[PDB]
Design a protein around this nucleic acid. Structure first.
Lengths: 419, 132, 124, 132, 132, 132
RNA sequence: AGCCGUGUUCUGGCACCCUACGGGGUCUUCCAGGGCACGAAGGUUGCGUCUCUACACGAGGCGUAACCUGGGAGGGCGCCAAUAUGGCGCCUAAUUGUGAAUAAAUUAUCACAAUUACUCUUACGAGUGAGAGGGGGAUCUGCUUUGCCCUCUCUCCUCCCA
């Protein structure tokens, strides 16, 4: 009651998504008239008619209420919502201008507005046989289509870990206290036998004496963020197939049995399916109230290169240890993106959309001429969540366990840094 | 906590008056729900605001702010509508952590509610007398 | 100021057509409510935005703004739009505010402004 | 397109034999469904495979392969179980565009079927007679 | 080789426990079908993987691989989530020639089962006592 | 190591603006200092980085570099976060032979200052006009 | 051939500890000496930058947009071998129109000019699919007759190096 319909509380009073309502909502019937009136303006058989009578007789559609979700992952992926709108009969307004000049004194010319008609809706259809095949091949080529980027990401993250380890060595040298031994890393960048000039200082030979290290760190962590972005974008596979289905509308008489209206309506129905992947443990209970942003990822990288920093003259130790700790925090946060990755969500959607139409008036010798434009009011749209996946999936846990291992190791390394 | 007509019954010195704050809306730019007593002059009405700040990345602490404003009439012997002369303000900001608990939240609420009625704060605000 | 479906009848040169404006999300970046045509596509075409900016260090002086936008296509080939801004002081009264609203409506319905809008002719 | 016992009717020269291929399975490593005649010895079963390759970034074309495998028994007068001596292959390779039609591709199928029926291919395969 | 619920009865030292293993998705990258306990958490703990590599220029010599894997875990006194303190697992590998016969393969299966049932392997694993 | 506060004056065309630059640190790699305005915003804080080099191997002359940033700080930007819209770069570079003199350096120094103060460079830096 | 530097390495010590006041084990490198190999932006144009020139002008290098040479990856086709797949060969931006084209007509080669994915009038331009790149930092009580991070830029035979 406190939270909106599609939400619920957790153990420690944390915002969470109510699956029972998300995937199994309470349908309800509705018969809310939208345009239960039509207006004819003009003259027919020398009779100016401008009445306004109703057109809608009875409505009935089942649908679901309004819901709210919240991302259940660091990347911000939201869960899918079960929705239904399956009108018993379709609806399409026709703002046509019927007119026809017949002999023996018989002319008609007027314009119709807010005139709709109900017709059958082909709900019974299933393209599973056509959609299921279009996953296996995609998965098989996946590794052949992105193994390159996954491998370069795996090496980039290990390179980040190596950089952080070298930085940790330098910091530990700083903490223990030594000017000459502190140059262990300094010799790892100059590519040359650098000689001293005078008596230096600990913080002086560490604040920017490691500019190549800082530049490398910034560059390759931006590199990893960029690849990361794509990689998590790569954890989703949506595919759909569309076909055309022409339909006929029953006869109708906008006037009082003065002229008949017939023709055809062109629609297409497309069946779509989308599979997703994420953690299989914390997906149900993902703390959205305590997470770090994504900007601090750039913040930490640029901090050491920032030539504006007063904490180097007040508390170097605190600032550098906080740098470590926040890096480890972000690392652990992104770690959950690769722990036990399996099918977590799945939706199947069936939707109908008009494309074209045709109109033909026939009362006596095909006297009517129609030049109208069609527009729909009600379209069949049914999107249901499903958990049964009757086909071989692409379980991407084994191919990501390495990344999880790497991030855990790096977090251990950085949390091992003490004041 | 949906908005609706709030009617404070007995309030005041002798405890006889009542207040009816009608539902204005919620400024969404800052997530602030507002309530006003029935009138016409925006400058001559008792107003109340309630706001609910979730733990930001730079804060990590739940906040509830509740404000009350009451302006004086000092209506003049003619010459136009009254003029705002004095403005009584009250502000309360409650604060907890993420693993906060309903019970001690209501506890602090009721503690302050009964403090406001105890004789200490009575003459502390009433007569402006330093707590002594 | 509840947001709901608005049925504007007797509009146009001869006051015959009707506009059905359903509400949308109130823009949280600046607190502005929106209404759009019944749809489907015209929803993202036609627009009516409403905001009531309360006093601030630059306002003082409430400012109620109403913007209307009509794009005409055939790709949007033309775009008409209008904007109304009522500035009201804090001591202003709803008497004053309804007077002003009703006066502006009666002006737009008066012959002079139909002449100056529809055919775009200065009062001469 | 569920796999299922395929019973190919009149078959061969006079058109009197019949073939019964049981669904084996579908190798997903390359997305290929396998059918095989009911028997015991894998080396002496009639085999068939069908695959459909979607258009990829380096292909951008619909592909469908149908492969047919016919070993010959040549069982020896005792001395051990039969050994494979000869193996006939058939390899059919349909390829179409993203925008092609069920019409087109059914039509070209039935074209191929009629062609394999027609007298030309008859003696061009059976008799090994060069087309002339 | 349809995949479905497998009910492994009369197992353990006294042959009284039962194991229910449901199927999961088959590894497309190398074609490996998997079962695991009915769940919930033990599903990701216990695993049974089966694969059949068919012949090729590398394979000749069909190869049937059957891995079983049982993680023993527990909960520290004070912890919440169980940690795996041990991992038992075994691998069975059949290599058959293309001329192999269902006859041969079947008795092989049965002989392996009977050996596993025999006192010899019984004590050779249960107690890890070599044959002497 | 430069740790001195500079109280500048006669800023802008009117000459009535004043500024103060407080040190922020030293960059122990290239002999660079850092000075900023009092504040807590990049756009509102003006940057002054002086740098002095000595001959090592790549060059045989000194280098006195001076980089000043005067970002345009906008007030109204959708919130109380004054951002930057126009970054004002001012880069000065010197090169003195190792056999030069403090007299010569002061000579160039004062000539630069006087040209900057005169109406010569003002027309080319502010109004952007060529030498007619 | 010198050596500048890089790498390769070994001798004494730097260091401790031990032995016994006889003498030894060592790791981290470095101080000296010794053994051995080594030093190359493909060309053009265009932009920002470091240094030398100096009236200016220019020059070298740097980082880079784009252009050409070769080379590679994909590359399609056929030839195939035993299916899967292994091997062999051949091949690549292309299409249309204008100049030359033979005495006269075509007219390949070259040049010249445009095109590139679908639907929309074929007018301008719009929509969508696909990919490429960049910026934003994007979660709290949002919608959803769309399934889900927002937005900017570029391409519809490609990508990579000298």
């Amino acid at each position: 009651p406190k939270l909106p319909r599609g939400l619920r509380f957790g153990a420690d009073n944390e915002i969470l998504n109510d699956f029972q309502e998300l995937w199994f909502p309470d349908l309800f019937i509705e018969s809310s008239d939208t345009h239960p009136w039509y207006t004819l303006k003009g003259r027919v058989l020398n009779a100016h008619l401008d009445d306004r009578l109703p057109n809608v007789g009875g409505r009935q559609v089942r649908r679901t209420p309004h819901r709210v979700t919240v991302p259940i992952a660091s990347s911000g992926l939201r869960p899918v919502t079960t929705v239904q709108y399956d009108p018993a009969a379709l609806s399409f307004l026709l703002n046509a201008r019927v007119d026809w000049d017949f002999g023996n004194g018989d002319s008609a010319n007027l314009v119709i507005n807010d005139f709709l008609f109900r017709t059958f809706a082909p709900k019974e259809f299933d393209f599973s046989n056509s959609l299921v095949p279009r996953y296996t091949q995609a998965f098989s080529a996946f590794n052949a289509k992105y193994g390159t980027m996954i491998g370069e990401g795996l090496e980039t993250i290990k390179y980040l870990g190596l950089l952080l380890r070298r930085l940790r060595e330098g910091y530990r040298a700083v903490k223990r206290g030594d000017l000459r031994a502190l140059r262990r890393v300094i010799q790892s960048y100059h590519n040359g036998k650098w000689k001293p000039a005078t008596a230096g200082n600990l913080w002086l030979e560490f604040r920017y004496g490691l500019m190549p290290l800082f530049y490398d760190i910034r560059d390759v962590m931006l590199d990893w963020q960029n690849r990361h972005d794509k990689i998590q974008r790569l954890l989703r596979f949506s595919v759909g197939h569309g076909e055309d289905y022409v339909v006929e509308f029953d006869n109708l008489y906008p006037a009082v049995a003065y002229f008949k209206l017939k023709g055809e309506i062109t629609l297409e129905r497309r069946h779509r399916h989308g599979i997703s992947y994420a953690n299989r443990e914390g997906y149900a209970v993902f703390d959205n109230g305590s997470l770090r942003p994504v900007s601090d990822w750039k913040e930490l990288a640029t901090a050491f290169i920032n030539p504006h920093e007063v904490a180097w003259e007040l508390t170097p130790y605190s600032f550098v240890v906080d740098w470590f700790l926040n890096v480890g925090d972000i690392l652990a946060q992104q770690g959950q993106l690769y722990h036990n990755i399996d099918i977590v969500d799945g939706f199947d959607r069936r939707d109908i959309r008009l494309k074209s139409f045709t109109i033909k008036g026939e009362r006596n010798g095909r006297p009517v001429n129609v030049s109208a434009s069609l527009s729909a009011v009600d379209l069949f749209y049914s999107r249901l969540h499903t958990s049964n996946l009757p086909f071989a999936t692409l379980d991407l846990d084994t191919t990501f366990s390495s990344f999880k291992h790497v991030l855990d190791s790096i977090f251990l390394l950085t949390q091992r840094v003490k004041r | 906590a949906k908005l609706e007509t709030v009617t404070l019954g007995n309030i005041g010195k002798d405890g006889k008056q009542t207040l009816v704050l009608n539902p204005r809306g919620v400024n969404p730019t800052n997530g602030v729900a507002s309530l006003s007593q029935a009138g016409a002059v925006p400058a001559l009405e008792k107003r109340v605001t309630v706001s609910v700040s979730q733990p930001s990345r730079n804060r990590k602490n739940y906040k509830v702010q509740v404000k009350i404003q009451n302006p004086t009439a000092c209506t003049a012997n003619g010459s136009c509508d009254p003029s705002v002369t004095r403005q009584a303000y009250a502000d309360v900001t409650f604060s907890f952590t993420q693993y906060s608990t309903d019970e001690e939240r209501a506890f602090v609420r009721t503690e302050l509610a009964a403090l406001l009625a105890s004789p200490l704060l009575i003459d502390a605000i009433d007569q402006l007398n330093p707590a002594y």
